[PDB]
């Protein structure tokens, strides 16, 4: 199972962070995750999204040559 990148290991920090992301996402407020590149922001955010039954996942990865067309097309998918 360690080959699959979606596997998470629950500790106190990631469960406290999952609680805060649920609290802010239920508060209709934008959330900005800003940390060093090894902190696993994408992994913990997908962990909070996929295990839940109240939120969904869209795959958007920004780049230098990215406009609102990609965002709008990803919006039409769901």
């Amino acid at each position: 199972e360690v080959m699959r990148p979606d596997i998470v290991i629950p500790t106190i920090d990631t469960i406290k962070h999952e609680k805060i992301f649920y609290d802010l996402l239920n508060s209709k407020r934008g959330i900005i995750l800003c940390g060093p590149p090894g902190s696993g922001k994408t992994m913990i955010m997908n962990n909070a999204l996929r295990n839940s039954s109240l939120y969904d996942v869209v795959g958007i990865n920004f780049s230098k040559d990215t406009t609102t067309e990609h965002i709008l097309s990803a919006l039409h998918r769901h």
Binding site: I9, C34, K41
Partner: protein, 467 residues
Amino acid sequence: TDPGRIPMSERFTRHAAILYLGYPSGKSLSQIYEIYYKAIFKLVPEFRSYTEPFARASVHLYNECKARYSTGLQSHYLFSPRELTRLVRGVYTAINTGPRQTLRSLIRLWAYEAWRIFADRLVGVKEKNSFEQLLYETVDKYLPNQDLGNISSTSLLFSGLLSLDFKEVNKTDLVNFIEERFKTFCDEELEVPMVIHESMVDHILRIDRALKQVQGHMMLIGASRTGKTILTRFVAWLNGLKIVQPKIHRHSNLSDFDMILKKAISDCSLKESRTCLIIDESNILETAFLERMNTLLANADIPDLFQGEEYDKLLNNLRNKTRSLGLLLDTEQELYDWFVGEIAKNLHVVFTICDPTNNKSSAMISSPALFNRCIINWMGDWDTKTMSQVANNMVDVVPMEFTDFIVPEVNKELVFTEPIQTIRDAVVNILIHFDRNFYQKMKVGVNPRSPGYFIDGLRALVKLVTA
């Protein structure tokens, strides 16, 4: 703070809350990698009790490597827990395809994986000496086991070529096998007079290790004429991969790059044949090619490559291939993510970088979609033992000992070759000393030194002394 990240205005962060996700502490990393090593050691239950020392050793070694080698020394010393995760995955894929394991063999396997995931990016020789001292300290602190041999990179040669399983192999047997297989490779492919030495054996082993993993990509950093792409072609011929070579001249644009990428992707998916993509430094003219590599590597494919009629014919070809293999896939999402799984499983990209101090090379190695998802291999310059071995192997053909040569009593550090007995060792030492003095006196600084001058001088020397 790092370059490539444009600071956004406060008007966008006005309406959004902000968080800082710091690095996990020692206890959290320790517990997470206890869980990882318990999962890995479930394969071999005889060493189940060693889960705590291995996780403690990995966490402490990562912390020491982060504290010692910083960003100030080199721009690519950005360590992360992702390297620890890659270490765990490498240990798993070595144990799973390995023989009956032993405690000494397990420690050697972990040491080899740490060598190939943690200190294959180091530059200075004293940095590698500090790393092997760190390995000695970590092993003697957390795994107090005797009867353990050398942990240096020459004595840790784990290969899958010589057997059916990932196991340690003898040095001379591996050297003979590489010699004969490279002779067969030169017979069956392009011919190049490459000499065999232990540093290239270690490099060819680590690039074979990197090119056998699922979604395995790496970037090779080293001076020119070090022999990078020939080693890449040698491994990709050993593993049955197909070489695709981007033939890009000066009168080239993004259309040729896109059509080569499209042909490679179509041959990877529809024809189900694995391919190796050697992206050279000179093959990236503008930043659009770097953006295309970012899209191809951070994700699994390029969504911008197939649009409209191209997208429709791609989906038609994917449906035809799925119906040919008799797989019940109907929705477009299943076909698309099966296709990107096929691309991520059957496409390996490698990079050859000549001068890392260039602005284009700095932008390449500072890219966020390249540094994290590729194994940084630093070939660097040639150390003195490699030069001595190459010169000894190249001057032995010609008769050279025909003069009354007396042994000169010189200093210990002034002799790089094993101590002088014949005129050949003196000639090799003279050549290496002149090369070092010449590269010192031209003020090369920290730029890599291309060893092609040494090989050209050796060839001219043997031809001229023959005449």
